[PDB]
């Protein structure tokens with residue numbers, strides 16, 4: 001659902 | 007120390023950025039990456055300050071803590087008493103466009119046809135059409151819906167890249183930058199115009215700016231709007247003059263993002279850069295126009311009238327709008 005893709 | 011490092015996506019944006027850098031007296035300088043996602047990484051690492059993004063890319067960047075800074079604003083009608091910089095933004099119409107002569111293609115007969123998309127993860131080219139299709143089919147298998155596509159940024163050997171053409175040498179097939187012939191609004195409308203695909207997912211303005219002599223470019227100089235129709239979500243087809251009643255969504259304008267810690271400096275520098283190089287800028291057309299690139303939409307959309315201040319210091323969620331954010335979330339559950 002949430003958190004940076006890098 | 008308000009030198010702003012712009013991030014240019016691919017070699018043609020790099021080249022425009024270099025010209026801007028030169029004209030700005032090095033007040034802006036340039037970092038280059040091969041893809042918007044790599045540019046967002048440079049920004050997260052503090053090796054670049056800023057770039058202008060489509061809304062689907064604002065979602066990526068904003069999840070990583072970058073923030074919107076100024077929005078593209080184009081020609082209006084209501085709020086005409088206001089300066090472009092202060093005018094609220096109105097969003098753009100995401101549309102699905104087909105050939106008038108491709109008769110009986112509707113929204114409801116899209117299965118197994120050939121699609122042209124601006125790039126994976128973009129608003130009009132991808133999150134809206136695929137979000138709607140996944141929803142309507144009950145299926146996460148969006149990579150099996152169209153027989154072939156050009157969706158720059160998908161696996162180059164997959165059917166989602168089959169129609170992509172790569173650069174003048176055939177290299178770079180399906181890279182998500184303007185080297186790919188079918189990349190971007192204008193690339194995807196070109197993939198329709200040349201009939202490589204059956205349907206292009208672009209926005210309303212693309213159709214108008216590359217038809218009826220509005221573009222002199224060789225693939226576009228002979229196109230007539232009357233040869234195109236929009237696909238409405240109710241299964242009907244309309245002329246391209248009816249986009250207000252025939253679109254898949256209203257998209258949030260493309261906007262500059264930066265690290266939060268640099269946002270105020272990037273804003274100040276941009277507001278002054280556009281006084282010099284934007285639409286009626288002191289030095290445009292004379293020396294440099296920031297919002298021109300012969301229809302290739304390099305760094306900014308060529309239809310941009312100014313970059314405008316945002317009301318309410320919005321977070322990326324507030325800028326995108328809660329409904330668009332959730333549509334993006336839901337679609338991402340697929341992959």
Ligand SMILES: *[C@@H]1O[C@H](CO)[C@@H](O[C@@H]2O[C@H](CO)[C@@H](O)[C@H](O)[C@H]2NC(C)=O)[C@H](O)[C@H]1NC(C)=O
Pocket residue numbers: 081082083099210211212214215220248249250309
């Ligand atoms: C769809 O896009 C076109 C192109 O942006 C719009 O047509 C422009 O509208 C402005 C003012 O409303 C005119 O002054 C321009 O001259 C038009 N440009 C061209 C190239 O024709 C059209 O209004 C948009 N339609 C909707 C519903 O948004």
Ligand SMILES: *[C@@H]1O[C@H](CO)[C@@H](O[C@@H]2O[C@H](CO)[C@@H](O)[C@H](O)[C@H]2NC(C)=O)[C@H](O)[C@H]1NC(C)=O
Pocket residue numbers: 133134137138141328329332333336
């Ligand atoms: C695809 O379907 C989902 C499920 O309905 C949509 O997400 C919902 O959107 C509404 C309206 O914004 C929200 O109130 C719901 O809470 C969302 N639901 C869930 C389960 O998250 C989504 O908008 C649809 N996608 C598109 C592109 O229309």
Ligand SMILES: Nc1ccn([C@H]2C[C@H](O)[C@@H](CO)O2)c(=O)n1
Pocket residue numbers: 096097098099210250256
């Ligand atoms: N290019 C755009 C962007 C938005 N709208 C207006 C019409 C939409 O229906 C309205 C949605 O509030 O915004 C429009 O006509 N053209």
Ligand SMILES: *[C@@H]1O[C@H](CO)[C@@H](O)[C@H](O)[C@H]1NC(C)=O
Pocket residue numbers: 029030031033282
């Ligand atoms: C560059 O920035 C400096 C400092 O604000 C300003 O004095 C100058 O006018 C700017 N020149 C250009 C071309 O941006």
Ligand SMILES: [Fe+3]
Pocket residue numbers: 060061128129130257260
């Ligand atoms: Fe977009």
Ligand SMILES: [Zn+2]
Pocket residue numbers: 253255256
């Ligand atoms: Zn609408």
Ligand SMILES: [Zn+2]
Pocket residue numbers: 318319320321324
């Ligand atoms: Zn807020």
